[PDB]
Amino acid sequence: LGVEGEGIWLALGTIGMLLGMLYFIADGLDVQDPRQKEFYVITILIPAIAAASYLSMFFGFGLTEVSLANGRVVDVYWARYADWLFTTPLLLLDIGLLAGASQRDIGALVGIDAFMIVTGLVATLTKVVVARYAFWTISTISMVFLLYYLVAVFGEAVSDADEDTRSTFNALRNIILVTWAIYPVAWLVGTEGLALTGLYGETLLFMVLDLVAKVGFGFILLRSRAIM
Amino acid sequence: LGVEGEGIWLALGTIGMLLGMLYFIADGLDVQDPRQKEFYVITILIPAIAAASYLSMFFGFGLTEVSLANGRVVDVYWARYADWLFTTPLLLLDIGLLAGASQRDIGALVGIDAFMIVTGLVATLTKVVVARYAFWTISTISMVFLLYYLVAVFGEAVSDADEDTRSTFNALRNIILVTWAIYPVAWLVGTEGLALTGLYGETLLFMVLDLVAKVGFGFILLRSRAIM
Amino acid sequence: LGVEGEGIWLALGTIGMLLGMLYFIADGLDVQDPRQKEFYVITILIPAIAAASYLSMFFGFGLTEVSLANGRVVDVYWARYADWLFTTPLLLLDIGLLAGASQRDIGALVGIDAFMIVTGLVATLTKVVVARYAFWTISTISMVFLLYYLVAVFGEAVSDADEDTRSTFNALRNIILVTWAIYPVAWLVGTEGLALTGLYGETLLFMVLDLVAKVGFGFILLRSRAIM
Ligand SMILES: CCCCCCCC/C=C\CCCCCCCC(=O)OC[C@@H](O)CO
Ligand SMILES: CCCCCCCC/C=C\CCCCCCCC(=O)OC[C@@H](O)CO
Ligand SMILES: CCCCCCCC/C=C\CCCCCCCC(=O)OC[C@@H](O)CO
Ligand SMILES: CCCCCCCC/C=C\CCCCCCCC(=O)OC[C@H](O)CO
Ligand SMILES: CCCCCCCC/C=C\CCCCCCCC(=O)OC[C@H](O)CO
Ligand SMILES: CCCCCCCC/C=C\CCCCCCCC(=O)OC[C@H](O)CO
Ligand SMILES: CCCCCCCC/C=C\CCCCCCCC(=O)OC[C@H](O)CO
Ligand SMILES: CCCCCCCC/C=C\CCCCCCCC(=O)OC[C@H](O)CO
Ligand SMILES: CCCCCCCC/C=C\CCCCCCCC(=O)OC[C@H](O)CO
Ligand SMILES: *C/C=C(C)/C=C/C=C(C)/C=C/C1=C(C)CCCC1(C)C
Ligand SMILES: *C/C=C(C)/C=C/C=C(C)/C=C/C1=C(C)CCCC1(C)C
Ligand SMILES: *C/C=C(C)/C=C/C=C(C)/C=C/C1=C(C)CCCC1(C)C
């Protein structure tokens, strides 16, 4: 339900995350080695967090109304950003641990990621239309850099590893590039930006993106020989 | 002194934390060795945070009214959660460093702790009654997970340590298990939950729990041979 | 344009931070060595964050009104604290890495820093007049601690290093001591505290302090042979 029917995607999203989390848990019951176990922990925590955010939004807590200087009223699920603030660095940690990136490089990307999510949240909450777009632009620029550094810096880090590790890395990297690049488009075409689509469409789009980026990614990671 | 006299416990809690903090600082003045000193820093910082949160609540900052969909109006001291968000991980850090747990395991427990505190805050703040209990359940589940991993993972980590360190670990573990397990019950019986007791009783109970969990714990930790 | 003209300093602040960030980026383009690279990443991220913060304030995001129990109504840019919450630990990381301080000493300063910024935020937002000054006093006390530890603990850590590093460290330390010490004074003389000056003057003062503390500090750090 929700404001305009979009709660269905919230509920499905919850269940989806919850199913993936349970699958991951079920997958790691028989694992002793600490590094593999670390990948389990991170990758279980990610959809746990996303399931809880989704559930909060289904119930109406992740939701505030914002009145723009436009007179335009926008229905804002801000719990997304809460979710994103924690799960995107964890996803970066996951693949960075896969890649054998240094503490330094992971920290760098996480810093950039955090900047990206917070300036996104400002873009979403600000009443000034020009501010909305300026911050969407700042956030997207930071995203472009994050994705470049992911490719160059983590790719270099993974370049001396075995074939399975490099292969899994490349798969996960491409999942990040494609799915993560779509989020700013989604923001632009949904109600928060140009409102070409409404809340229902936008919510469906982010449900699909989140499911791919968290459960799809998690599946690909946790099944690899690379983490083993 | 608050909405219904509970400020007196807010005042006593403040004073108690402060006195604990002062004792610990005074206890640590001559400490030179870095690991021991690290236990002092963490264990001083905890009641400092809690003293500051209690004082903010005493002044009414960090108190909000929440009107539930039931119509019931609840007086919510949310700054407690801010306090907990940082202090419960520090407590876990404290016992982890005592146990000789790895960076990974500690991070894991901090993760699940964070999940517990945040979902508990959602439980406290959401207007939808079924949601309040759903989130309380999610949070309590995480608590059980957390406590189990504390016993099994940190207990296994400490199992190769000397007798003093094992015995201290067992004391601190038992403090956490007993006191921390009561918090969700307190929430349930207090005004955010079943409202079997009013704001005053609940504030008293959390004051006692907080004091044992921070000052009692701290005292037991810092007086041990184990950290020297 | 601001509430009372202070927008001019928000804009000039935005621009100076952005130019500092771009200068640092230009300067670090060929840097290959990992350790110097870290200094670049941190020192570039600091004015990035501060620039985004300034821009948010310029657009009126991050500005609330607080009605005090006195009846005074205060125009409070709270986004500053958001800014400070992240940049001040990073500044501390930057100099700690320069000083060769341990993870524990750095974490310690970051923890007391965090305490300082959050208690200052409480001071800024609380409606209770006595509480404003109580938290300002708490915060300033922790600042004094932080500065002493910075001098004693980072000074000892840096004491075994080469002369270039000790000298650069002493330069950066003195910038922190002098500029950081002025902030609580600025809070006290400005509209949040005794109101001896208005929002325009206070905003100007913080702009100058922030520019020195971030771009001046970053310049001195990044141009030193010590980090290369
Ligand atoms: C009003 C909002 C204005 C924008 C606020 C943006 C706040 C988010 C930005 C940054 C927060 C994340 C900071 C991340 C800080 C990362 C520090 C780092 O690079 O560590 C490297 C070491 O591990 C190497 O050994
Ligand atoms: C009367 C108000 C009581 C509640 C507010 C208390 C605020 C905390 C008290 C003073 C501010 C400074 C807190 C500073 C907290 C940082 C931890 C620390 O104190 O380290 C001390 C070192 O010597 C350890 O080795
Ligand atoms: C106008 C208000 C906003 C000003 C800042 C907006 C642009 C911020 C810049 C980058 C976004 C990420 C935050 C800064 C993160 C910098 C990390 C880095 O590795 O920098 C590499 C560069 O030096 C190129 O090699
Ligand atoms: C806004 C909040 C954003 C953060 C949210 C939580 C995400 C934490 C991610 C990484 C933990 C930091 C430590 C990263 C360690 C990387 C692994 C590593 O460095 O391994 C080699 C090292 O030598 C082994 O001790
Ligand atoms: C709401 C208030 C939040 C307040 C901030 C909470 C987050 C604390 C973050 C890091 C501290 C980690 C504990 C410090 C671990 C190292 C301690 C140490 O060894 O310190 C040595 C130094 O030389 C002498 O202090
Ligand atoms: C993200 C949700 C809010 C979290 C707020 C946390 C506040 C700081 C308290 C604990 C963190 C300690 C650092 C992270 C965990 C690593 C612990 C560690 O550094 O352990 C070192 C030890 O040497 C290994 O054996
Ligand atoms: C939107 C409202 C509802 C939101 C509900 C979710 C809110 C965040 C919950 C938990 C924070 C998780 C922080 C995780 C910090 C890192 C922990 C970690 O990395 O643990 C594994 C370790 O690295 C190797 O074992
Ligand atoms: C008021 C009540 C509130 C709810 C409180 C619920 C009880 C606490 C939950 C879990 C801790 C107990 C964990 C039990 C398992 C300990 C770990 C373990 O048994 O590990 C294997 C063992 O070593 C093989 O001999
Ligand atoms: C109130 C919210 C809680 C407080 C929020 C604070 C946010 C800090 C963010 C970035 C700085 C992170 C600095 C982490 C420094 C850890 C110590 C370290 O990395 O030391 C390495 C050593 O120099 C070689 O091994
Ligand atoms: C699991 C959560 C994920 C993968 C979240 C990804 C979010 C982004 C890549 C955010 C993108 C944004 C921009 C880069 C522009 C501003 C709007 C945002 C926040 C949607
Ligand atoms: C020093 C502060 C401490 C030890 C606080 C501990 C708090 C908890 C263990 C929280 C418990 C709760 C649940 C597990 C269910 C939701 C209600 C909470 C947040 C009180
Ligand atoms: C880049 C920003 C910097 C370096 C800001 C530092 C800010 C402080 C050291 C603030 C100190 C304050 C007090 C000590 C008292 C409370 C008022 C504050 C927050 C301004």
mmCIF file with all atom_site columns, N, CA and C in Angstrom, chain A residues 103-104 108 111-112 115 119 121-122 125-128 130-131 134-135 138, chain C residues 34-35 37-38 41 45 48-53 55-56 59-61 103:
data_model
loop_
_atom_site.group_PDB
_atom_site.id
_atom_site.type_symbol
_atom_site.label_atom_id
_atom_site.label_alt_id
_atom_site.label_comp_id
_atom_site.label_asym_id
_atom_site.label_entity_id
_atom_site.label_seq_id
_atom_site.pdbx_PDB_ins_code
_atom_site.Cartn_x
_atom_site.Cartn_y
_atom_site.Cartn_z
_atom_site.occupancy
_atom_site.B_iso_or_equiv
_atom_site.pdbx_formal_charge
_atom_site.auth_seq_id
_atom_site.auth_comp_id
_atom_site.auth_asym_id
_atom_site.auth_atom_id
_atom_site.pdbx_PDB_model_num
ATOM 1   N N  . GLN A 1 103 ? 43.981 -1.442 3.491  1.00 0.00 ? 103 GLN A N  1
ATOM 2   C CA . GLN A 1 103 ? 43.164 -0.636 4.393  1.00 0.00 ? 103 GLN A CA 1
ATOM 3   C C  . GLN A 1 103 ? 42.986 0.793  3.883  1.00 0.00 ? 103 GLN A C  1
ATOM 4   N N  . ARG A 1 104 ? 44.082 1.366  3.400  1.00 0.00 ? 104 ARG A N  1
ATOM 5   C CA . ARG A 1 104 ? 44.098 2.711  2.827  1.00 0.00 ? 104 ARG A CA 1
ATOM 6   C C  . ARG A 1 104 ? 43.111 2.963  1.696  1.00 0.00 ? 104 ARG A C  1
ATOM 7   N N  . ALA A 1 108 ? 39.645 5.003  1.610  1.00 0.00 ? 108 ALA A N  1
ATOM 8   C CA . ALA A 1 108 ? 39.448 6.067  0.617  1.00 0.00 ? 108 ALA A CA 1
ATOM 9   C C  . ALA A 1 108 ? 38.085 5.962  -0.093 1.00 0.00 ? 108 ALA A C  1
ATOM 10  N N  . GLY A 1 111 ? 35.169 6.659  2.270  1.00 0.00 ? 111 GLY A N  1
ATOM 11  C CA . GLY A 1 111 ? 35.058 8.098  2.435  1.00 0.00 ? 111 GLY A CA 1
ATOM 12  C C  . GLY A 1 111 ? 34.310 8.747  1.287  1.00 0.00 ? 111 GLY A C  1
ATOM 13  N N  . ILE A 1 112 ? 34.682 8.336  0.076  1.00 0.00 ? 112 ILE A N  1
ATOM 14  C CA . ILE A 1 112 ? 34.033 8.894  -1.106 1.00 0.00 ? 112 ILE A CA 1
ATOM 15  C C  . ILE A 1 112 ? 32.559 8.487  -1.189 1.00 0.00 ? 112 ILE A C  1
ATOM 16  N N  . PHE A 1 115 ? 30.520 10.394 1.347  1.00 0.00 ? 115 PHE A N  1
ATOM 17  C CA . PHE A 1 115 ? 30.273 11.717 0.751  1.00 0.00 ? 115 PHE A CA 1
ATOM 18  C C  . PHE A 1 115 ? 29.124 11.652 -0.267 1.00 0.00 ? 115 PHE A C  1
ATOM 19  N N  . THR A 1 119 ? 25.560 13.684 0.392  1.00 0.00 ? 119 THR A N  1
ATOM 20  C CA . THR A 1 119 ? 25.202 14.772 -0.526 1.00 0.00 ? 119 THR A CA 1
ATOM 21  C C  . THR A 1 119 ? 23.960 14.408 -1.333 1.00 0.00 ? 119 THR A C  1
ATOM 22  N N  . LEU A 1 121 ? 21.521 12.722 0.151  1.00 0.00 ? 121 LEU A N  1
ATOM 23  C CA . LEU A 1 121 ? 20.460 12.947 1.102  1.00 0.00 ? 121 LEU A CA 1
ATOM 24  C C  . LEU A 1 121 ? 20.097 14.435 1.175  1.00 0.00 ? 121 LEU A C  1
ATOM 25  N N  . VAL A 1 122 ? 21.108 15.300 1.188  1.00 0.00 ? 122 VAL A N  1
ATOM 26  C CA . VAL A 1 122 ? 20.867 16.739 1.047  1.00 0.00 ? 122 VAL A CA 1
ATOM 27  C C  . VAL A 1 122 ? 20.064 17.076 -0.210 1.00 0.00 ? 122 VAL A C  1
ATOM 28  N N  . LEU A 1 125 ? 16.424 16.142 0.542  1.00 0.00 ? 125 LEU A N  1
ATOM 29  C CA . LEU A 1 125 ? 15.698 16.860 1.593  1.00 0.00 ? 125 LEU A CA 1
ATOM 30  C C  . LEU A 1 125 ? 15.568 18.364 1.389  1.00 0.00 ? 125 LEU A C  1
ATOM 31  N N  . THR A 1 126 ? 16.465 18.960 0.606  1.00 0.00 ? 126 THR A N  1
ATOM 32  C CA . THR A 1 126 ? 16.486 20.416 0.436  1.00 0.00 ? 126 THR A CA 1
ATOM 33  C C  . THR A 1 126 ? 15.289 20.952 -0.345 1.00 0.00 ? 126 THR A C  1
ATOM 34  N N  . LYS A 1 127 ? 14.794 22.094 0.121  1.00 0.00 ? 127 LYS A N  1
ATOM 35  C CA . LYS A 1 127 ? 13.574 22.709 -0.386 1.00 0.00 ? 127 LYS A CA 1
ATOM 36  C C  . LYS A 1 127 ? 13.863 23.535 -1.638 1.00 0.00 ? 127 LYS A C  1
ATOM 37  N N  . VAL A 1 128 ? 15.119 23.926 -1.806 1.00 0.00 ? 128 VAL A N  1
ATOM 38  C CA . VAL A 1 128 ? 15.496 24.821 -2.893 1.00 0.00 ? 128 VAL A CA 1
ATOM 39  C C  . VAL A 1 128 ? 15.729 23.982 -4.147 1.00 0.00 ? 128 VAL A C  1
ATOM 40  N N  . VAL A 1 130 ? 17.027 24.503 -7.126 1.00 0.00 ? 130 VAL A N  1
ATOM 41  C CA . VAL A 1 130 ? 18.380 24.576 -7.645 1.00 0.00 ? 130 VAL A CA 1
ATOM 42  C C  . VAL A 1 130 ? 19.349 23.802 -6.747 1.00 0.00 ? 130 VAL A C  1
ATOM 43  N N  . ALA A 1 131 ? 19.134 23.827 -5.428 1.00 0.00 ? 131 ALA A N  1
ATOM 44  C CA . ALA A 1 131 ? 19.980 23.073 -4.497 1.00 0.00 ? 131 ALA A CA 1
ATOM 45  C C  . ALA A 1 131 ? 19.849 21.571 -4.702 1.00 0.00 ? 131 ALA A C  1
ATOM 46  N N  . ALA A 1 134 ? 21.916 20.872 -7.824 1.00 0.00 ? 134 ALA A N  1
ATOM 47  C CA . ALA A 1 134 ? 23.340 21.056 -7.564 1.00 0.00 ? 134 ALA A CA 1
ATOM 48  C C  . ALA A 1 134 ? 23.923 19.902 -6.743 1.00 0.00 ? 134 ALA A C  1
ATOM 49  N N  . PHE A 1 135 ? 23.190 19.462 -5.725 1.00 0.00 ? 135 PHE A N  1
ATOM 50  C CA . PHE A 1 135 ? 23.637 18.363 -4.874 1.00 0.00 ? 135 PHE A CA 1
ATOM 51  C C  . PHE A 1 135 ? 23.491 17.018 -5.565 1.00 0.00 ? 135 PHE A C  1
ATOM 52  N N  . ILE A 1 138 ? 26.722 17.129 -7.559 1.00 0.00 ? 138 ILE A N  1
ATOM 53  C CA . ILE A 1 138 ? 27.844 16.833 -6.656 1.00 0.00 ? 138 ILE A CA 1
ATOM 54  C C  . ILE A 1 138 ? 27.921 15.335 -6.325 1.00 0.00 ? 138 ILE A C  1
ATOM 55  N N  . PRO C 1 34  ? 52.230 5.316  -1.800 1.00 0.00 ? 34  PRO C N  1
ATOM 56  C CA . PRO C 1 34  ? 51.043 5.088  -0.963 1.00 0.00 ? 34  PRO C CA 1
ATOM 57  C C  . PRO C 1 34  ? 50.895 5.995  0.262  1.00 0.00 ? 34  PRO C C  1
ATOM 58  N N  . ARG C 1 35  ? 51.954 6.221  1.032  1.00 0.00 ? 35  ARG C N  1
ATOM 59  C CA . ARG C 1 35  ? 51.860 7.005  2.262  1.00 0.00 ? 35  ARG C CA 1
ATOM 60  C C  . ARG C 1 35  ? 51.526 8.475  2.001  1.00 0.00 ? 35  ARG C C  1
ATOM 61  N N  . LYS C 1 37  ? 50.169 9.528  -0.773 1.00 0.00 ? 37  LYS C N  1
ATOM 62  C CA . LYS C 1 37  ? 48.828 9.360  -1.318 1.00 0.00 ? 37  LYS C CA 1
ATOM 63  C C  . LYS C 1 37  ? 47.760 9.406  -0.207 1.00 0.00 ? 37  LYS C C  1
ATOM 64  N N  . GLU C 1 38  ? 47.999 8.767  0.938  1.00 0.00 ? 38  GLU C N  1
ATOM 65  C CA . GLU C 1 38  ? 46.997 8.803  2.003  1.00 0.00 ? 38  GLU C CA 1
ATOM 66  C C  . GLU C 1 38  ? 46.723 10.234 2.457  1.00 0.00 ? 38  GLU C C  1
ATOM 67  N N  . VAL C 1 41  ? 44.558 11.957 0.004  1.00 0.00 ? 41  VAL C N  1
ATOM 68  C CA . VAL C 1 41  ? 43.153 11.567 0.055  1.00 0.00 ? 41  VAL C CA 1
ATOM 69  C C  . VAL C 1 41  ? 42.423 12.233 1.224  1.00 0.00 ? 41  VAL C C  1
ATOM 70  N N  . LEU C 1 45  ? 39.626 15.205 0.957  1.00 0.00 ? 45  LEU C N  1
ATOM 71  C CA . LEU C 1 45  ? 38.283 14.908 1.472  1.00 0.00 ? 45  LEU C CA 1
ATOM 72  C C  . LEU C 1 45  ? 37.804 15.946 2.494  1.00 0.00 ? 45  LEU C C  1
ATOM 73  N N  . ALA C 1 48  ? 36.557 19.056 0.535  1.00 0.00 ? 48  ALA C N  1
ATOM 74  C CA . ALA C 1 48  ? 35.342 18.578 -0.130 1.00 0.00 ? 48  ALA C CA 1
ATOM 75  C C  . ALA C 1 48  ? 34.102 18.615 0.788  1.00 0.00 ? 48  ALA C C  1
ATOM 76  N N  . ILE C 1 49  ? 34.233 18.010 1.966  1.00 0.00 ? 49  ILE C N  1
ATOM 77  C CA . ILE C 1 49  ? 33.142 17.923 2.934  1.00 0.00 ? 49  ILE C CA 1
ATOM 78  C C  . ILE C 1 49  ? 32.761 19.333 3.388  1.00 0.00 ? 49  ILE C C  1
ATOM 79  N N  . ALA C 1 50  ? 33.772 20.144 3.691  1.00 0.00 ? 50  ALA C N  1
ATOM 80  C CA . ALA C 1 50  ? 33.474 21.485 4.186  1.00 0.00 ? 50  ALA C CA 1
ATOM 81  C C  . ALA C 1 50  ? 32.800 22.347 3.096  1.00 0.00 ? 50  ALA C C  1
ATOM 82  N N  . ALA C 1 51  ? 33.239 22.195 1.853  1.00 0.00 ? 51  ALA C N  1
ATOM 83  C CA . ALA C 1 51  ? 32.626 22.890 0.730  1.00 0.00 ? 51  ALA C CA 1
ATOM 84  C C  . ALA C 1 51  ? 31.162 22.477 0.555  1.00 0.00 ? 51  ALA C C  1
ATOM 85  N N  . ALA C 1 52  ? 30.883 21.177 0.634  1.00 0.00 ? 52  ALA C N  1
ATOM 86  C CA . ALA C 1 52  ? 29.500 20.727 0.476  1.00 0.00 ? 52  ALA C CA 1
ATOM 87  C C  . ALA C 1 52  ? 28.624 21.283 1.614  1.00 0.00 ? 52  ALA C C  1
ATOM 88  N N  . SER C 1 53  ? 29.190 21.311 2.823  1.00 0.00 ? 53  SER C N  1
ATOM 89  C CA . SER C 1 53  ? 28.527 21.872 4.006  1.00 0.00 ? 53  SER C CA 1
ATOM 90  C C  . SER C 1 53  ? 28.175 23.359 3.854  1.00 0.00 ? 53  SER C C  1
ATOM 91  N N  . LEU C 1 55  ? 28.018 24.969 1.045  1.00 0.00 ? 55  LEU C N  1
ATOM 92  C CA . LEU C 1 55  ? 27.014 25.111 0.005  1.00 0.00 ? 55  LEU C CA 1
ATOM 93  C C  . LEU C 1 55  ? 25.610 24.815 0.550  1.00 0.00 ? 55  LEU C C  1
ATOM 94  N N  . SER C 1 56  ? 25.483 23.784 1.388  1.00 0.00 ? 56  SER C N  1
ATOM 95  C CA . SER C 1 56  ? 24.177 23.436 1.954  1.00 0.00 ? 56  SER C CA 1
ATOM 96  C C  . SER C 1 56  ? 23.646 24.602 2.798  1.00 0.00 ? 56  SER C C  1
ATOM 97  N N  . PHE C 1 59  ? 22.414 27.652 0.748  1.00 0.00 ? 59  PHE C N  1
ATOM 98  C CA . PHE C 1 59  ? 21.078 27.428 0.196  1.00 0.00 ? 59  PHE C CA 1
ATOM 99  C C  . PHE C 1 59  ? 20.005 27.343 1.277  1.00 0.00 ? 59  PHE C C  1
ATOM 100 N N  . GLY C 1 60  ? 20.429 27.429 2.529  1.00 0.00 ? 60  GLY C N  1
ATOM 101 C CA . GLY C 1 60  ? 19.524 27.541 3.654  1.00 0.00 ? 60  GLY C CA 1
ATOM 102 C C  . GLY C 1 60  ? 19.175 26.184 4.228  1.00 0.00 ? 60  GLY C C  1
ATOM 103 N N  . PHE C 1 61  ? 19.783 25.148 3.667  1.00 0.00 ? 61  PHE C N  1
ATOM 104 C CA . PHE C 1 61  ? 19.684 23.824 4.247  1.00 0.00 ? 61  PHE C CA 1
ATOM 105 C C  . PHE C 1 61  ? 20.645 23.796 5.427  1.00 0.00 ? 61  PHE C C  1
ATOM 106 N N  . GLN C 1 103 ? 47.539 3.542  16.385 1.00 0.00 ? 103 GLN C N  1
ATOM 107 C CA . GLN C 1 103 ? 46.096 3.452  16.163 1.00 0.00 ? 103 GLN C CA 1
ATOM 108 C C  . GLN C 1 103 ? 45.315 3.793  17.421 1.00 0.00 ? 103 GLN C C  1
#
